[model samples]
Target: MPDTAINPRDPVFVSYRHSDGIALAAELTWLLRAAGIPVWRDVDDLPPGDTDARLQQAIDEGISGAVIIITPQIADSRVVREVEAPRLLRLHRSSPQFALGIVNAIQTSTGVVDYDAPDRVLGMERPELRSVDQKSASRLGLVTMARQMLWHRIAAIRPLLSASGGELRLSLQTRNTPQVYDRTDADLDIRIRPSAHEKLPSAHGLEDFAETAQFLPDAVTRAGANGVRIEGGAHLSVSIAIGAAIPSTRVGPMTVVDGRGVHWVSSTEPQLPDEPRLRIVRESTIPSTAPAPGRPDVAAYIDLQHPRSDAAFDNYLTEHAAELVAWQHLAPTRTGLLDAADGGTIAAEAVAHIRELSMTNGNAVVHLMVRGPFGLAVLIGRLTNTLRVVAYEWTDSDAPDGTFMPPRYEPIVQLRASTPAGVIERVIVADAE
Candidate 1:
């Protein structure tokens, strides 16, 4: 039912409440802009005036469609019903070609509540409303909504690849790899190859493209390209574009370049943590215990003992019990220690206790020996929020017999300070002995 001739220049008006709607609104704006659709949201486009009058002008002369975000906040607000909903109804009735969409922004346990357009707006049934929960859960929903908004307008839309060729190029650019927050079961890989023939416009090409295209760039890589790996998936949707000369940058996938100009866009994913250096130490051979014990009077040790099967760790700790009396060993029910929500909470609490003990001992650097799920180590770095914490990995190799070899410790992540921005700086494998 999508019209192939819909104009790309016609902006779409997004209506949202300031409370729970702002986050979703910001995400929708990014997605719409990335797909090359102009958006007119109050935060970005509206000037100071009577909100109703300004909104009327934007609906009447400024935009081609409306995407009203329906949350409990918006649904309960009488002003939204009195002013904004009616405007959308009038615009929908006035133009047959005008695109209209409703996003159910409520997160719930049972299911999303169905929101229908008010009965007063004759001939206007509630448009198909998409449900997106808060944060990372809403990513695919946002993408689907953006695509639905533009499906009628963009004549051609498909994934962009290095080998792709077409006419009238445009790009969805980013400084870093675009992350797909959807969990899948198959291996997911995103590959980007920069255009060889076209040269970057200037030293500020990155800034220019992001600015012009309406996106934010982060962690620009040295190779000028970016990528993401997903463990499980049948297939990924991959990069998409509407125009030609859609080339990859050395750093990211959200980009497009043509003979005439370039466009770029980027947005953050909530589920994906920003610490790209965080490594997963799954090998059981990595040593959990450290050598040359720190001054016991001033230092504290934490022995996390939820490992699957490790006689090596048990014997070593037993032999060195007196030397490591200050050692606080945590025991869990299973090997996959933090696989459940309660487990993660328990792990966080134990780590907090370790920090407290270390503080009591003059804030001495805490030496850690972990033998739980490999994934727990990554979570430990996040929860501790300190670079002083030193973690060890095992490096024992396979022996010819059924017996295991001696385990040795190698440094892993050093949790730096938790910044004012709430970002934990994780220094990976940097002299963490």
Candidate 2:
């Protein structure tokens, strides 16, 4: 085999002794092409050169990254000795960037070997060759090894396309909406920039992500996959909060207000005041004890019901108490706002502690309400999820006179956590005849 000349602008150069790597070079060239990297080799690059100078010139000018095949046969060849000698010297000079030494261990009948010190070079040992007869198949086998080896080398640099200068290379933040009930056209999109600037747009429906305007302020940058590149810029970490509501199973609404954003999803759109926008008229907190100096009692509430079982209902309180004790008074229960759940139970305990109240008052027929350590933290994490509402009414079959019995089957809403983007309004349970 003769010298397969390559150039510098070329993405990769296949350098190996003609006696050892003829087929290997061709295979490597094909592999590099498949990876979107241009390749150059002498047998393919050197035209009918008018002079030796033209041959060397073309080879020298086109070579950028070198893929060297190292077998004892090629290692000892004169052409490789003279042409590749300087690059090998540079291997030890400081830091070797693009020079890779692929050991033809198959020919040597040795386990795979790799270049110990290479900034850019990757070693691939064809351990499969250790059992094969290199003398008979070295040509074809080495070609296959070169192709596999070159591909690994090229992959190492492809990720540089995503590089952006900085210590914190990427950042990510997410805003989500409550699981919807009435799948109508009312929707909202939030455009977030580096600063607190956000422009909410009305969207009827969506199947893809839309990019936000508002140039990122000095505080942050952005990268791939809806990720933001944030600097130490303090305000970059700041976020604006909003809240919204979804229709409740019990003919009410689900409303949460905070920094992220607001939502309004209802079975029947609520009658907005003559004023155009919607306002979540969350009731002011009534303190559990006497009103504080300037602040009223911070009372929060959740309304929930279950099969009228004393043990099961009390068990709800016990389980909630355990959850509160687990968190060490960090948060409290949400009462009068949502359904009864394991989490609401835990929060209720804290509220009891803060408001100096007990689980239940002394009255029967009165709705059981747990109020005390009410807060927003209870709604973080998985609690930050959306809720689906399932409402149903039942007619009581048992009654002395059967006067419809005040709806023995009063409507109760079941709240469930769900994906913001997934299809909502799944029937968890159906009416039975």
Compare the candidates by TM-score and give the number of the best one. 1
Best prediction by lDDT:
1
List candidate 2 stretches off by more than 4 Å: 1-10, 50-62, 88-96, 109-160, 163-433
Residue 320 displacement (Å), model 2: 65
Q: Kindly report which residue stretches of model 1 are placed more than 4 angstroms away from their true locations once superposed.
A: 1-8, 76-79, 107-109, 112-137, 155-433
lDDT of 1: 0.40
lDDT of 2 at 98: 43
Residue lDDT tens for model 2, 303-369: 2222122332233334443222111112112223433233223332322332222112111111112
The TM-score values for the models, in the order shown, are 0.36, 0.27
Candidate 1, residue 168: the lDDT equals 23
